[PDB]
Amino acid sequence: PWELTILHTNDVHSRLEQTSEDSSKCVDASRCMGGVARLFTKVQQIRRAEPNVLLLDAGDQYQGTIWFTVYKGAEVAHFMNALRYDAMALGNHEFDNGVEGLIEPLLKEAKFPILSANIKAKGPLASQISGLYLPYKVLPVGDEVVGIVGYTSKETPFLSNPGTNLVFEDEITALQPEVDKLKTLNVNKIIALGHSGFEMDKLIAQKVRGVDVVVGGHSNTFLYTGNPPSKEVPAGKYPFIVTSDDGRKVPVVQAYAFGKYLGYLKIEFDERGNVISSHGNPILLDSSIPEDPSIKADINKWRIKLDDYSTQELGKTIVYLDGSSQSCRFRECNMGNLICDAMINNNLRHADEMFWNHVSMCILNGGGIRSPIDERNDGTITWENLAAVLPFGGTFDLVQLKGSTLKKAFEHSVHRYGQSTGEFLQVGGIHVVYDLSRKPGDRVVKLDVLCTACAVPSYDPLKMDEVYKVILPNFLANGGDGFQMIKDELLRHDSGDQDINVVSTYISKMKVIYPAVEGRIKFS
Amino acid sequence: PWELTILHTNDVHSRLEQTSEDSSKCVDASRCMGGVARLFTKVQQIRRAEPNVLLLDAGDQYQGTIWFTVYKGAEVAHFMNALRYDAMALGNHEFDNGVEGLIEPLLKEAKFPILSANIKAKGPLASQISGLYLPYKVLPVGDEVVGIVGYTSKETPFLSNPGTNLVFEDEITALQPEVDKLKTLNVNKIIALGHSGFEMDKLIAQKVRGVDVVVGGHSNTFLYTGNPPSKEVPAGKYPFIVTSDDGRKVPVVQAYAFGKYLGYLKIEFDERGNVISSHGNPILLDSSIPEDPSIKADINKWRIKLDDYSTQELGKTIVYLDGSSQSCRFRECNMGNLICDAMINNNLRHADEMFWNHVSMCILNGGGIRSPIDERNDGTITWENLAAVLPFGGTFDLVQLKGSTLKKAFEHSVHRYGQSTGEFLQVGGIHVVYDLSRKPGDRVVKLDVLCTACAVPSYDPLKMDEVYKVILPNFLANGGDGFQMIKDELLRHDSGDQDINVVSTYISKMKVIYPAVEGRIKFS
Ligand SMILES: Nc1ncnc2c1ncn2[C@@H]1O[C@H](CO)[C@@H](O)[C@H]1O
Ligand SMILES: Nc1ncnc2c1ncn2[C@@H]1O[C@H](CO)[C@@H](O)[C@H]1O
Ligand SMILES: [Ca+2]
Ligand SMILES: [Ca+2]
Ligand SMILES: [Cl-]
Ligand SMILES: [Cl-]
Ligand SMILES: [Zn+2]
Ligand SMILES: [Zn+2]
Ligand SMILES: [Zn+2]
Ligand SMILES: [Zn+2]
């Protein structure tokens, strides 16, 4: 049998430097994990041991820390080139700076192929981008060849800024003829590498005839066989085996997110390219593995410009930005309005006919706002200032919530009001009125929401059965601050941009800000 | 006696082309008035008749039409040079594009001296601007000399964007030593030329010893001796004679605004430079006076770039901009919110310690909103589109109103509600609640206003005795749409920027707009 070792990452999300255990900023360096210098060491070790190795990335390198803010994808090309990745699929966040912000920093500088079979370019863009990403690449590995066919979430236009000259096709429809064709060209070993989420990966494994292994991303899915090595709870075994329509067993793998783990799957193939076995597990990149000194020095050198950036003026406020807990855990606070307005602004996406935008509504727990910003230094606002307000390494995510779930969330916001607890919600696109004399769970007396499927945005009463799009912190999507109803009742949850970056981009765009407290939240 | 003819303009406000009788856009060319080509003809005629002539401008050439929008003061230098002005005082609107927007287009290109004795530069700006404007200029006229000493409203920092490196001193304090000095240098004929308003001009005439004539501006004051030639109602005789503290009779003159009239004052002086007589009257620049063909051709040539500009994209809307009367004369409409938000944004000025900004509140009659803007052409918004919404050639002005006056204005807004009448008010920085079941004059049941002397903008109940700053159309400041209480009770009224330009600048800054109807106005 011919044995291949597939190493893979996904949803690394700009975690170029080692992180704490929960993927936030590293504080105690001796206990940190991940980062590209540590990944380099482990990949180099495995390449000395294993004759036939592919290192694959399943997309979403872009977006997540100050690295992406400042270097805009140049750091992705540079460090993935240093790690000698063999191929990468395009993720939704590769479109965050538009097509131009994908072509120039990443597609033109990567030394490895960048893949997606289900993205079609139209208009003048087609000739500009032709060949810069590919539907597939056939790679030599030893005396053999392996075809790698790429795919990208069809939901990308709702999640990122791909423009209107890219069309995202159904993955299975796009994939099948490419896999068909490779088989006719005597490529008998096929890896589907792409960025649509575990549920779609399993459908691809089941329905795309000839795929031998699926390497996926997007859903930050952690799979593990045995007792897991850290805090992530496995969604299933690694690999996760799908029985295909043609009767084969097809391994599906993913490796969580943030560069914390290196996926590692060993596959034996027979001479006709059929998988005869598959085994592996993601490797926790913990502090027992040394950071490669050369990569780490390079990281340190690139960090200088980040340190410079962190104190540079982004824009100005002419008002006090009240992110105090005495305000934000008790009433509407202007820092909460500012952050919710930034959240909506970041989520302006190309709209279908019937919508002005697909989302209008925002909630933000007041316990997530960790500092004011005063008017010292002539109202200058810096990245460092915003990092004190939003210090947790969160993202502002898109969820779908029934109106009845949102009503429960607003009851939870005030269920024990008066104690300075974190669950009190700041809002955008929502007007709520509380009567604190009523029993807990019966305190919300009016709840109006800004329409989306309207030509003129305006407020209507919340409807219990309607499913609303809402932007909120990943902490809340995950049921943080007692918002268990959000986690247990949501219909869809997509991970969005870095919290600090959402706000910094908004301030930079606005230039001079003056957020008011304007009656989005009232009592009585 | 030595006889001097002083010709003067003030507050021309970008009316380079002939206008209708009310100074708005010319429609019927055979009935139009003013414009620089017609002014040229009249000035040339008077210079053939009168040996000793000065042509003076008292400031506020900048701001008022698409000319200023596109040419940013280059048109002012070019056309005032063509008319061979002898001197100009700086007005408040000369600072609308900051100090940089004054130095480069106007101060460096004017062929005549530009004056202000009461503006002092500090910091690095002092050496950058030194000599580009002057406190005074001594001009030869025949065998004689005449000193011209300049002044500018001390309120300029509240009205325009002069920055923080210019200090506006008390006019009388600044003027006196310059006039003192000229007298010691055997300059015995002194004209004070400046831009502080008729009330200050009269104080300068009374108190600045040695001033022989005051030529003023800023208040758009029309003075006339006899039956007036058009619709402007005279505030007093021309000249208006002040008895000075030293016992002399000192003529004060002004010539309305918009280039409609050419001031014309004949002064006889004795050999010691004392005024022995003064007589004159502004000349209505009506269609009996031909437009000079060469100036008019030059105007036509400069107009090409304006015509190009008028259809160019300023920014984009992703919402329908509802400026329909069925919306704006009956309820809150998003086009009214947009325009009020632009009005406040344009009036962000350097703030004293206690304020986030000096003004937060806006009212706009719904009858002043004359068109929607739909989402045809991918949401593009052009100057031409905005000219359909705001077609009257108005400005958005700053007034001071007691709370009791504003309450009356909101009662007037709904006194005959239901008929689609123009007086219904759109708002910013104000939240009003009407109960239309109550008698007319008793329909306002809640009226909250956004604070200014606060670190965090927030709403408090309107107070009847407090005097509020409000931005509103000149039409309302003048008592239009039955708002007689505004005209009769206001404490201060300053003329602001062109209505269309306020909105175009705001849209260009915001790039993509999505104004909502958000409950600024409610019923019941
Ligand atoms: N990761 C996080 N993201 C946002 N908010 C958080 C996070 N962790 C803790 N908090 C907030 O901090 C409060 C405790 O100070 C909690 O009530 C919660 O509101
Ligand atoms: N010069 C103007 N500026 C603003 N609004 C005006 C002007 N002239 C008329 N209107 C408005 O038009 C309405 C009549 O259509 C009036 O009720 C008033 O609201
Ligand atoms: Ca195979
Ligand atoms: Ca004299
Ligand atoms: Cl999924
Ligand atoms: Cl005055
Ligand atoms: Zn991701
Ligand atoms: Zn993704
Ligand atoms: Zn003026
Ligand atoms: Zn003025």
mmCIF file with all atom_site columns, N, CA, C and O in Angstrom, chain A residues 318-320 322 334 345 348 356 431 450 455-459 510 514-518, chain B residues 318-320 322 334 345 348 356 431 450 455-459 510 514-518:
data_model
loop_
_atom_site.group_PDB
_atom_site.id
_atom_site.type_symbol
_atom_site.label_atom_id
_atom_site.label_alt_id
_atom_site.label_comp_id
_atom_site.label_asym_id
_atom_site.label_entity_id
_atom_site.label_seq_id
_atom_site.pdbx_PDB_ins_code
_atom_site.Cartn_x
_atom_site.Cartn_y
_atom_site.Cartn_z
_atom_site.occupancy
_atom_site.B_iso_or_equiv
_atom_site.pdbx_formal_charge
_atom_site.auth_seq_id
_atom_site.auth_comp_id
_atom_site.auth_asym_id
_atom_site.auth_atom_id
_atom_site.pdbx_PDB_model_num
ATOM 1   N N  . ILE A 1 318 ? -15.431 63.399 19.669 1.00 0.00 ? 318 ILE A N  1
ATOM 2   C CA . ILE A 1 318 ? -15.659 64.679 20.313 1.00 0.00 ? 318 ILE A CA 1
ATOM 3   C C  . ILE A 1 318 ? -16.550 64.533 21.544 1.00 0.00 ? 318 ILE A C  1
ATOM 4   O O  . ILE A 1 318 ? -16.989 65.517 22.110 1.00 0.00 ? 318 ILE A O  1
ATOM 5   N N  . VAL A 1 319 ? -16.861 63.281 21.918 1.00 0.00 ? 319 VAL A N  1
ATOM 6   C CA . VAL A 1 319 ? -17.655 62.991 23.063 1.00 0.00 ? 319 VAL A CA 1
ATOM 7   C C  . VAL A 1 319 ? -16.848 62.028 23.973 1.00 0.00 ? 319 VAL A C  1
ATOM 8   O O  . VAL A 1 319 ? -15.954 61.295 23.504 1.00 0.00 ? 319 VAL A O  1
ATOM 9   N N  . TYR A 1 320 ? -17.244 61.959 25.227 1.00 0.00 ? 320 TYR A N  1
ATOM 10  C CA . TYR A 1 320 ? -16.704 60.859 26.137 1.00 0.00 ? 320 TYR A CA 1
ATOM 11  C C  . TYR A 1 320 ? -17.356 59.571 25.673 1.00 0.00 ? 320 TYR A C  1
ATOM 12  O O  . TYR A 1 320 ? -18.560 59.516 25.422 1.00 0.00 ? 320 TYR A O  1
ATOM 13  N N  . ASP A 1 322 ? -18.504 56.379 26.858 1.00 0.00 ? 322 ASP A N  1
ATOM 14  C CA . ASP A 1 322 ? -18.811 55.841 28.195 1.00 0.00 ? 322 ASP A CA 1
ATOM 15  C C  . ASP A 1 322 ? -18.984 54.324 28.100 1.00 0.00 ? 322 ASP A C  1
ATOM 16  O O  . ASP A 1 322 ? -20.058 53.820 27.762 1.00 0.00 ? 322 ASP A O  1
ATOM 17  N N  . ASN A 1 334 ? -23.368 55.102 25.557 1.00 0.00 ? 334 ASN A N  1
ATOM 18  C CA . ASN A 1 334 ? -23.004 55.449 24.198 1.00 0.00 ? 334 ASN A CA 1
ATOM 19  C C  . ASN A 1 334 ? -21.898 54.586 23.577 1.00 0.00 ? 334 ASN A C  1
ATOM 20  O O  . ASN A 1 334 ? -21.762 54.462 22.347 1.00 0.00 ? 334 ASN A O  1
ATOM 21  N N  . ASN A 1 345 ? -22.499 48.239 10.513 1.00 0.00 ? 345 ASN A N  1
ATOM 22  C CA . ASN A 1 345 ? -21.795 48.773 9.368  1.00 0.00 ? 345 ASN A CA 1
ATOM 23  C C  . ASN A 1 345 ? -20.888 47.686 8.706  1.00 0.00 ? 345 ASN A C  1
ATOM 24  O O  . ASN A 1 345 ? -20.798 47.574 7.476  1.00 0.00 ? 345 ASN A O  1
ATOM 25  N N  . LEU A 1 348 ? -22.790 45.191 6.316  1.00 0.00 ? 348 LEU A N  1
ATOM 26  C CA . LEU A 1 348 ? -23.462 45.677 5.061  1.00 0.00 ? 348 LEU A CA 1
ATOM 27  C C  . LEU A 1 348 ? -22.938 44.779 3.944  1.00 0.00 ? 348 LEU A C  1
ATOM 28  O O  . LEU A 1 348 ? -21.716 44.727 3.684  1.00 0.00 ? 348 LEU A O  1
ATOM 29  N N  . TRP A 1 356 ? -32.911 46.251 2.139  1.00 0.00 ? 356 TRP A N  1
ATOM 30  C CA . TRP A 1 356 ? -31.880 47.288 2.103  1.00 0.00 ? 356 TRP A CA 1
ATOM 31  C C  . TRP A 1 356 ? -30.540 46.714 2.570  1.00 0.00 ? 356 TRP A C  1
ATOM 32  O O  . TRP A 1 356 ? -29.510 47.041 2.042  1.00 0.00 ? 356 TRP A O  1
ATOM 33  N N  . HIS A 1 431 ? -35.437 48.612 19.743 1.00 0.00 ? 431 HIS A N  1
ATOM 34  C CA . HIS A 1 431 ? -35.929 49.551 20.806 1.00 0.00 ? 431 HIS A CA 1
ATOM 35  C C  . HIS A 1 431 ? -36.697 48.714 21.796 1.00 0.00 ? 431 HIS A C  1
ATOM 36  O O  . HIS A 1 431 ? -37.676 48.034 21.508 1.00 0.00 ? 431 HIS A O  1
ATOM 37  N N  . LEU A 1 450 ? -35.860 46.961 13.767 1.00 0.00 ? 450 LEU A N  1
ATOM 38  C CA . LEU A 1 450 ? -35.703 47.684 12.462 1.00 0.00 ? 450 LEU A CA 1
ATOM 39  C C  . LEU A 1 450 ? -35.894 46.662 11.354 1.00 0.00 ? 450 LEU A C  1
ATOM 40  O O  . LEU A 1 450 ? -35.224 45.643 11.310 1.00 0.00 ? 450 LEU A O  1
ATOM 41  N N  . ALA A 1 455 ? -37.845 49.132 1.887  1.00 0.00 ? 455 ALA A N  1
ATOM 42  C CA . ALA A 1 455 ? -37.047 50.159 1.168  1.00 0.00 ? 455 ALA A CA 1
ATOM 43  C C  . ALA A 1 455 ? -36.572 51.270 2.103  1.00 0.00 ? 455 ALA A C  1
ATOM 44  O O  . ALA A 1 455 ? -35.501 51.848 1.902  1.00 0.00 ? 455 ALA A O  1
ATOM 45  N N  . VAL A 1 456 ? -37.382 51.548 3.128  1.00 0.00 ? 456 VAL A N  1
ATOM 46  C CA . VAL A 1 456 ? -37.069 52.612 4.140  1.00 0.00 ? 456 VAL A CA 1
ATOM 47  C C  . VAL A 1 456 ? -36.976 51.890 5.495  1.00 0.00 ? 456 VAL A C  1
ATOM 48  O O  . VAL A 1 456 ? -37.969 51.361 6.016  1.00 0.00 ? 456 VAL A O  1
ATOM 49  N N  . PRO A 1 457 ? -35.785 51.866 6.115  1.00 0.00 ? 457 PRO A N  1
ATOM 50  C CA . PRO A 1 457 ? -35.716 51.189 7.419  1.00 0.00 ? 457 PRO A CA 1
ATOM 51  C C  . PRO A 1 457 ? -36.609 51.874 8.451  1.00 0.00 ? 457 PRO A C  1
ATOM 52  O O  . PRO A 1 457 ? -36.553 53.120 8.598  1.00 0.00 ? 457 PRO A O  1
ATOM 53  N N  . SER A 1 458 ? -37.418 51.121 9.168  1.00 0.00 ? 458 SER A N  1
ATOM 54  C CA . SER A 1 458 ? -38.322 51.641 10.188 1.00 0.00 ? 458 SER A CA 1
ATOM 55  C C  . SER A 1 458 ? -38.648 50.511 11.156 1.00 0.00 ? 458 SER A C  1
ATOM 56  O O  . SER A 1 458 ? -38.401 49.328 10.839 1.00 0.00 ? 458 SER A O  1
ATOM 57  N N  . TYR A 1 459 ? -39.203 50.871 12.308 1.00 0.00 ? 459 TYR A N  1
ATOM 58  C CA . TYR A 1 459 ? -39.394 49.919 13.434 1.00 0.00 ? 459 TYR A CA 1
ATOM 59  C C  . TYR A 1 459 ? -40.780 49.298 13.439 1.00 0.00 ? 459 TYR A C  1
ATOM 60  O O  . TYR A 1 459 ? -41.800 50.031 13.193 1.00 0.00 ? 459 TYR A O  1
ATOM 61  N N  . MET A 1 510 ? -15.506 56.753 9.795  1.00 0.00 ? 510 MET A N  1
ATOM 62  C CA . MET A 1 510 ? -16.329 57.901 10.241 1.00 0.00 ? 510 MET A CA 1
ATOM 63  C C  . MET A 1 510 ? -15.482 59.170 10.476 1.00 0.00 ? 510 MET A C  1
ATOM 64  O O  . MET A 1 510 ? -16.053 60.276 10.457 1.00 0.00 ? 510 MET A O  1
ATOM 65  N N  . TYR A 1 514 ? -19.396 60.882 17.450 1.00 0.00 ? 514 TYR A N  1
ATOM 66  C CA . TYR A 1 514 ? -20.131 61.554 18.511 1.00 0.00 ? 514 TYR A CA 1
ATOM 67  C C  . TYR A 1 514 ? -21.377 60.765 18.892 1.00 0.00 ? 514 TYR A C  1
ATOM 68  O O  . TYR A 1 514 ? -22.509 61.278 18.882 1.00 0.00 ? 514 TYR A O  1
ATOM 69  N N  . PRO A 1 515 ? -21.192 59.478 19.242 1.00 0.00 ? 515 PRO A N  1
ATOM 70  C CA . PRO A 1 515 ? -22.372 58.680 19.607 1.00 0.00 ? 515 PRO A CA 1
ATOM 71  C C  . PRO A 1 515 ? -23.160 59.215 20.798 1.00 0.00 ? 515 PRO A C  1
ATOM 72  O O  . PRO A 1 515 ? -22.561 59.614 21.837 1.00 0.00 ? 515 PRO A O  1
ATOM 73  N N  . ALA A 1 516 ? -24.477 59.224 20.709 1.00 0.00 ? 516 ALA A N  1
ATOM 74  C CA . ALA A 1 516 ? -25.403 59.685 21.716 1.00 0.00 ? 516 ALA A CA 1
ATOM 75  C C  . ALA A 1 516 ? -26.099 58.520 22.368 1.00 0.00 ? 516 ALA A C  1
ATOM 76  O O  . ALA A 1 516 ? -26.131 57.410 21.820 1.00 0.00 ? 516 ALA A O  1
ATOM 77  N N  . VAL A 1 517 ? -26.614 58.725 23.594 1.00 0.00 ? 517 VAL A N  1
ATOM 78  C CA . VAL A 1 517 ? -27.649 57.893 24.175 1.00 0.00 ? 517 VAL A CA 1
ATOM 79  C C  . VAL A 1 517 ? -29.017 58.410 23.690 1.00 0.00 ? 517 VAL A C  1
ATOM 80  O O  . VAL A 1 517 ? -29.302 59.593 23.900 1.00 0.00 ? 517 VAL A O  1
ATOM 81  N N  . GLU A 1 518 ? -29.788 57.576 22.973 1.00 0.00 ? 518 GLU A N  1
ATOM 82  C CA . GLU A 1 518 ? -30.895 58.138 22.224 1.00 0.00 ? 518 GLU A CA 1
ATOM 83  C C  . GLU A 1 518 ? -32.252 57.466 22.447 1.00 0.00 ? 518 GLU A C  1
ATOM 84  O O  . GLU A 1 518 ? -33.229 57.712 21.697 1.00 0.00 ? 518 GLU A O  1
ATOM 85  N N  . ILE B 1 318 ? -28.189 52.886 0.117  1.00 0.00 ? 318 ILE B N  1
ATOM 86  C CA . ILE B 1 318 ? -28.703 51.535 -0.005 1.00 0.00 ? 318 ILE B CA 1
ATOM 87  C C  . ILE B 1 318 ? -30.165 51.452 0.423  1.00 0.00 ? 318 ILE B C  1
ATOM 88  O O  . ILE B 1 318 ? -30.713 50.373 0.551  1.00 0.00 ? 318 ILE B O  1
ATOM 89  N N  . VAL B 1 319 ? -30.779 52.616 0.700  1.00 0.00 ? 319 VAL B N  1
ATOM 90  C CA . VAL B 1 319 ? -32.148 52.695 1.079  1.00 0.00 ? 319 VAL B CA 1
ATOM 91  C C  . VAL B 1 319 ? -32.858 53.668 0.101  1.00 0.00 ? 319 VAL B C  1
ATOM 92  O O  . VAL B 1 319 ? -32.220 54.549 -0.509 1.00 0.00 ? 319 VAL B O  1
ATOM 93  N N  . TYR B 1 320 ? -34.171 53.572 0.050  1.00 0.00 ? 320 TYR B N  1
ATOM 94  C CA . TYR B 1 320 ? -34.987 54.645 -0.665 1.00 0.00 ? 320 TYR B CA 1
ATOM 95  C C  . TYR B 1 320 ? -34.932 55.875 0.220  1.00 0.00 ? 320 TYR B C  1
ATOM 96  O O  . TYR B 1 320 ? -35.100 55.797 1.437  1.00 0.00 ? 320 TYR B O  1
ATOM 97  N N  . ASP B 1 322 ? -36.828 58.772 1.180  1.00 0.00 ? 322 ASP B N  1
ATOM 98  C CA . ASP B 1 322 ? -38.249 59.143 1.060  1.00 0.00 ? 322 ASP B CA 1
ATOM 99  C C  . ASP B 1 322 ? -38.412 60.627 1.392  1.00 0.00 ? 322 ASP B C  1
ATOM 100 O O  . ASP B 1 322 ? -38.513 61.018 2.558  1.00 0.00 ? 322 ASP B O  1
ATOM 101 N N  . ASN B 1 334 ? -37.372 59.526 6.291  1.00 0.00 ? 334 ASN B N  1
ATOM 102 C CA . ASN B 1 334 ? -35.935 59.353 6.381  1.00 0.00 ? 334 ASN B CA 1
ATOM 103 C C  . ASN B 1 334 ? -35.102 60.404 5.636  1.00 0.00 ? 334 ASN B C  1
ATOM 104 O O  . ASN B 1 334 ? -33.922 60.656 5.939  1.00 0.00 ? 334 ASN B O  1
ATOM 105 N N  . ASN B 1 345 ? -23.890 67.779 11.223 1.00 0.00 ? 345 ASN B N  1
ATOM 106 C CA . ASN B 1 345 ? -22.519 67.445 10.906 1.00 0.00 ? 345 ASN B CA 1
ATOM 107 C C  . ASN B 1 345 ? -21.741 68.695 10.381 1.00 0.00 ? 345 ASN B C  1
ATOM 108 O O  . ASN B 1 345 ? -20.575 68.928 10.726 1.00 0.00 ? 345 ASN B O  1
ATOM 109 N N  . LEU B 1 348 ? -20.449 71.131 13.201 1.00 0.00 ? 348 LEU B N  1
ATOM 110 C CA . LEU B 1 348 ? -19.433 70.678 14.214 1.00 0.00 ? 348 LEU B CA 1
ATOM 111 C C  . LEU B 1 348 ? -18.332 71.734 14.185 1.00 0.00 ? 348 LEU B C  1
ATOM 112 O O  . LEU B 1 348 ? -17.694 71.966 13.135 1.00 0.00 ? 348 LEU B O  1
ATOM 113 N N  . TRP B 1 356 ? -19.726 69.161 23.999 1.00 0.00 ? 356 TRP B N  1
ATOM 114 C CA . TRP B 1 356 ? -19.221 68.273 22.954 1.00 0.00 ? 356 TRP B CA 1
ATOM 115 C C  . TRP B 1 356 ? -19.291 68.970 21.593 1.00 0.00 ? 356 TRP B C  1
ATOM 116 O O  . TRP B 1 356 ? -18.418 68.827 20.779 1.00 0.00 ? 356 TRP B O  1
ATOM 117 N N  . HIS B 1 431 ? -36.726 64.910 20.153 1.00 0.00 ? 431 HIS B N  1
ATOM 118 C CA . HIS B 1 431 ? -37.762 63.823 20.167 1.00 0.00 ? 431 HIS B CA 1
ATOM 119 C C  . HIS B 1 431 ? -39.047 64.461 20.624 1.00 0.00 ? 431 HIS B C  1
ATOM 120 O O  . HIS B 1 431 ? -39.187 65.033 21.699 1.00 0.00 ? 431 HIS B O  1
ATOM 121 N N  . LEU B 1 450 ? -31.484 67.028 22.735 1.00 0.00 ? 450 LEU B N  1
ATOM 122 C CA . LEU B 1 450 ? -30.119 66.452 22.967 1.00 0.00 ? 450 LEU B CA 1
ATOM 123 C C  . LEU B 1 450 ? -29.276 67.537 23.615 1.00 0.00 ? 450 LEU B C  1
ATOM 124 O O  . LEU B 1 450 ? -29.146 68.633 23.096 1.00 0.00 ? 450 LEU B O  1
ATOM 125 N N  . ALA B 1 455 ? -20.739 65.704 28.442 1.00 0.00 ? 455 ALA B N  1
ATOM 126 C CA . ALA B 1 455 ? -19.673 64.859 27.847 1.00 0.00 ? 455 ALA B CA 1
ATOM 127 C C  . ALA B 1 455 ? -20.249 63.738 26.983 1.00 0.00 ? 455 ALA B C  1
ATOM 128 O O  . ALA B 1 455 ? -19.634 63.322 25.997 1.00 0.00 ? 455 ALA B O  1
ATOM 129 N N  . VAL B 1 456 ? -21.438 63.266 27.367 1.00 0.00 ? 456 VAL B N  1
ATOM 130 C CA . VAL B 1 456 ? -22.145 62.163 26.634 1.00 0.00 ? 456 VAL B CA 1
ATOM 131 C C  . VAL B 1 456 ? -23.476 62.766 26.150 1.00 0.00 ? 456 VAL B C  1
ATOM 132 O O  . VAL B 1 456 ? -24.357 63.113 26.950 1.00 0.00 ? 456 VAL B O  1
ATOM 133 N N  . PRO B 1 457 ? -23.668 62.887 24.826 1.00 0.00 ? 457 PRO B N  1
ATOM 134 C CA . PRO B 1 457 ? -24.953 63.446 24.379 1.00 0.00 ? 457 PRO B CA 1
ATOM 135 C C  . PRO B 1 457 ? -26.124 62.561 24.801 1.00 0.00 ? 457 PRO B C  1
ATOM 136 O O  . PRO B 1 457 ? -26.083 61.324 24.586 1.00 0.00 ? 457 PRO B O  1
ATOM 137 N N  . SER B 1 458 ? -27.157 63.135 25.382 1.00 0.00 ? 458 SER B N  1
ATOM 138 C CA . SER B 1 458 ? -28.341 62.413 25.833 1.00 0.00 ? 458 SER B CA 1
ATOM 139 C C  . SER B 1 458 ? -29.500 63.400 25.911 1.00 0.00 ? 458 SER B C  1
ATOM 140 O O  . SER B 1 458 ? -29.274 64.629 25.895 1.00 0.00 ? 458 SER B O  1
ATOM 141 N N  . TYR B 1 459 ? -30.713 62.869 26.006 1.00 0.00 ? 459 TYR B N  1
ATOM 142 C CA . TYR B 1 459 ? -31.952 63.682 25.886 1.00 0.00 ? 459 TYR B CA 1
ATOM 143 C C  . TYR B 1 459 ? -32.492 64.116 27.239 1.00 0.00 ? 459 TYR B C  1
ATOM 144 O O  . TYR B 1 459 ? -32.502 63.284 28.211 1.00 0.00 ? 459 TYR B O  1
ATOM 145 N N  . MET B 1 510 ? -19.828 60.335 4.153  1.00 0.00 ? 510 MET B N  1
ATOM 146 C CA . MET B 1 510 ? -20.368 59.054 4.667  1.00 0.00 ? 510 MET B CA 1
ATOM 147 C C  . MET B 1 510 ? -20.147 57.889 3.679  1.00 0.00 ? 510 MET B C  1
ATOM 148 O O  . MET B 1 510 ? -20.174 56.725 4.120  1.00 0.00 ? 510 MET B O  1
ATOM 149 N N  . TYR B 1 514 ? -27.738 55.063 4.811  1.00 0.00 ? 514 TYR B N  1
ATOM 150 C CA . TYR B 1 514 ? -28.885 54.209 5.077  1.00 0.00 ? 514 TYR B CA 1
ATOM 151 C C  . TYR B 1 514 ? -29.752 54.794 6.184  1.00 0.00 ? 514 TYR B C  1
ATOM 152 O O  . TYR B 1 514 ? -30.048 54.142 7.201  1.00 0.00 ? 514 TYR B O  1
ATOM 153 N N  . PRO B 1 515 ? -30.185 56.056 6.009  1.00 0.00 ? 515 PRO B N  1
ATOM 154 C CA . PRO B 1 515 ? -31.016 56.659 7.061  1.00 0.00 ? 515 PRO B CA 1
ATOM 155 C C  . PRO B 1 515 ? -32.320 55.922 7.345  1.00 0.00 ? 515 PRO B C  1
ATOM 156 O O  . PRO B 1 515 ? -33.045 55.511 6.393  1.00 0.00 ? 515 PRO B O  1
ATOM 157 N N  . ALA B 1 516 ? -32.669 55.751 8.606  1.00 0.00 ? 516 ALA B N  1
ATOM 158 C CA . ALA B 1 516 ? -33.855 55.086 9.088  1.00 0.00 ? 516 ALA B CA 1
ATOM 159 C C  . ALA B 1 516 ? -34.844 56.089 9.622  1.00 0.00 ? 516 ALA B C  1
ATOM 160 O O  . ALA B 1 516 ? -34.484 57.231 9.940  1.00 0.00 ? 516 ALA B O  1
ATOM 161 N N  . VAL B 1 517 ? -36.134 55.708 9.669  1.00 0.00 ? 517 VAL B N  1
ATOM 162 C CA . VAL B 1 517 ? -37.124 56.345 10.515 1.00 0.00 ? 517 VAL B CA 1
ATOM 163 C C  . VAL B 1 517 ? -37.053 55.702 11.913 1.00 0.00 ? 517 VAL B C  1
ATOM 164 O O  . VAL B 1 517 ? -37.190 54.478 12.001 1.00 0.00 ? 517 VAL B O  1
ATOM 165 N N  . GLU B 1 518 ? -36.742 56.491 12.954 1.00 0.00 ? 518 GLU B N  1
ATOM 166 C CA . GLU B 1 518 ? -36.332 55.862 14.195 1.00 0.00 ? 518 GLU B CA 1
ATOM 167 C C  . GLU B 1 518 ? -37.072 56.331 15.450 1.00 0.00 ? 518 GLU B C  1
ATOM 168 O O  . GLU B 1 518 ? -36.660 56.030 16.596 1.00 0.00 ? 518 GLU B O  1
#
